[PDB]
Specification:
Chain lengths: 46, 352, 39
């Protein structure tokens, strides 16, 4: 667990861009947008 | 080749390449009034000099991770890689630590760096690592080596964060290179001898007067005027001066004759500037030119040697004392010398 | 222990609590069946 946390914090790109980074806010908006994408078939394989 | 001992005054600089322009930004701390640190512009020192007084830290202890964790669960050493250091601010006396709150909204996961009084906990300690593969752990650190400082508590790097106006160093997971420029080696500082970066004042042999400016009862434009005065001004805050040298490394060394240095007023924060149409006055940092505000101390009145000393990368030699050292101010541009006048006419001689 | 507390603090700083409560409170529908390839 310790080495996994250390590696994950050393390489922050492993976290989702919606959660981690200077862009997306976090898990709330990420999950809501994911639900909207699942509901809208325009963002999947036609 | 010079090793980094303990109890020595050092400077923490870094390089930032922003907007296709390189810059050398230093770590500074106000100390009193605020806790968090900020950045200082070591480069662009031609018109705006950096406040080196607050960019100086001292290393107190150099313990390993095991010794640190043991001491927390409970001498002139040599700095080694992988160790943990304790950076005490020279001016404020507090200790550099990793804060818990956040200020830069751009980093929703980074922490701020600032000063704290107590040395308890893991926040005030910083572990050192190299920035190159040629130097491994356990090796002795030398001058100019690129180092990486990691928080002991948060396990975060001392990162140089970029912002429009929030040019603030934080504790982020992206590393950043830091250079350590020594100022005072902690060696035998000659007692009674002039040392660089000191706060001192001038007196006369048989006049008992000191160089000062008018007090706060007058306006700032009147405080800009410079003169000599005696009496209770001999022990005053507005009578002190600081020798701000031009170099960023070893600026707290033995000041020798002829080298340039600005004369800063501690009370006003301005420098003794000179424009030829007038005499010398006080002007702020935002327009302080090197040639305009640079002065030196000669041991005589002649002009036998001007461009003789260029650069000495070391502690220097104990030459100028405090008591028995008759200096003479000499400007780097005009080469003039101090003269006392009689501006007060006989109508008001017995007054001020 | 100290390192365990530090790891817990790292996890807490990485993931905010209010975000977790909000994600928990979504109240998915309960459906003639439907497709379970969603939330």
């Amino acid at each position: 667990a310790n080495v996994v946390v250390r590696l994950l914090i050393r390489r922050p790109e492993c976290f989702g861009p919606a959660l981690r980074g200077e862009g997306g806010n976090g898990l709330l908006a990420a999950m809501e947008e994911a639900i909207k994408i699942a509901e809208d078939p325009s963002r999947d394989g036609p | 080749i010079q090793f980094l001992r303990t109890d020595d005054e050092v400077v923490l600089q870094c390089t930032a390449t922003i907007h296709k322009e390189q810059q050398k930004l230093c770590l500074a701390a106000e100390g009193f009034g605020n806790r968090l640190c900020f950045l200082e512009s070591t480069s662009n020192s031609k018109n705006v000099p950096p406040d080196l007084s607050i960019c100086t830290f001292v290393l107190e202890q150099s313990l390993s991770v095991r010794a640190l964790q043991e001491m927390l669960a409970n001498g002139h050493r040599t700095l080694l890689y992988g160790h943990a250091i304790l950076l005490r601010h020279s001016y404020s006396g507090m200790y550099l630590c990793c804060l818990s709150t956040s200020r830069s909204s751009t980093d929703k996961l980074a922490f701020d760096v600032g000063l704290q009084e107590d040395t308890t906990g893991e926040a005030c300690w910083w572990t050192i690592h190299p920035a190159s593969k040629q130097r491994s752990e356990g090796e002795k650190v030398r001058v100019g080596d690129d180092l990486i400082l990691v928080s002991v508590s948060s396990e975060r790097y001392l990162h140089l964060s970029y912002g429009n106006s929030s040019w603030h160093v934080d504790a982020a997971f992206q590393q950043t290179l830091w250079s350590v420029a020594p100022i005072s080696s902690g060696s035998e500082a000659a007692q009674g001898y002039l040392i660089g970066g000191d706060v001192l004042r001038l007196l006369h042999g048989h006049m008992d007067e000191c160089l000062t400016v008018p007090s706060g009862e007058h306006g700032e434009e009147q405080r800009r005027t410079v003169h000599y005065e005696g009496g209770a001004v001999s022990v005053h805050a507005r009578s002190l001066w600081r020798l701000e040298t031009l170099r960023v490394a070893w600026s707290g060394s033995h000041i020798r004759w002829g080298q340039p240095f600005r004369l800063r007023h501690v009370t006003t924060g301005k420098y003794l500037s000179l424009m030829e149409d007038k005499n010398l006055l006080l002007m702020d940092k935002e327009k302080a030119d090197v040639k305009s505000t640079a002065f030196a101390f000669r041991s005589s009145k002649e002009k036998l040697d001007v461009g003789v000393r260029k650069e000495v990368d070391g502690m220097g030699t104990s030459e100028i004392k405090y008591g028995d050292s008759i200096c003479y101010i000499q400007h780097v541009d005009t080469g003039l010398w101090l003269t006392y006048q009689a501006v007060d006419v006989k109508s008001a001689r017995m007054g001020s | 222990k100290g390192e365990a507390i530090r790891i817990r603090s790292i996890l807490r700083s990485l993931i905010p609590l209010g975000d977790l409560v909000g994600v928990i409170s979504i109240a998915f529908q309960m459906p003639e069946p439907d497709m379970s390839a969603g939330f």
